[PDB]
Each structure stands twice: as C-alpha cells, then as structure tokens.
Amino acid sequence: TEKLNEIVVRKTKNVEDHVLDVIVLFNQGIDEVILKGTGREISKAVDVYNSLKDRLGDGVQLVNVQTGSEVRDRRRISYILLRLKRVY
C-alpha cells in the first residue's frame, strides 16, 4: 500500500541535506517523490519543498498536498504528504 519513493523528513538531517537527497533521485530518472512529515516535522517538510522550489523553479511541481492523522507512538499524530514531480 505504501509504495513509491517516499522520503521521511527526519529531525536529524538538515533541510539542505533532504533537498539534495531528492535531487539525487530526480537526476537518475525517479521523477516523482513523496515528502512525508509527521508532527513537528510537518513544518520541516514544507521547508524542504520550498528550498527545492527555489533551486529548481519551473523544473519541479507540487502535484498535491495530503494531510491526515496516524497512530505512531501511542497517540494520534498529524502528518503531511507533499508529492513532487520533476518536470522538463
């Protein structure tokens, strides 16, 4: 069910690292990537997208945004999914 190339925005990797990681995928032909952010990292996921958008401009498109609530530890935590497509 949870296929594709999803990248979970980590609290331990900085924003620029995530941005560079996504472009590494884009460059090898993996044109669609999913950024996932849960809890406080939801803000970070948007930060990653913005940084990606600043350096790729018209070259990347935010296909859609999906927000929800999951399980995780013990209580319902919020999450966001930013689906990105590299465009030429």
Q: Which of 24, 30, 63, 68 binds a second copy (CB under 8 A)?
A: 68
* Residues belonging to the chain: 88
Pick what 17 binds: a second copy, Zn ion, none; C-beta below 5 to 8 Å, kind-dependent: Zn ion
Nearest Cα to Cα of residue 6 among 22, 24, 23:
22
Binding status of residue 26 toward a second copy by CB under 8 A: no
Ligand-binding site membership of 21 (annotated): yes
* Strand-strand pairing, 6-8 and 60-70: unpaired
Nearest Cα to Cα of residue 39 among 3, 75, 5:
75
Question: Which residue lies nearer to a second copy by CB, 29 or 82?
Answer: 82
**Site residues (CB under 5 A) for Zn ion?**
17, 21
Numbered residues of the known binding site: 13, 17, 21
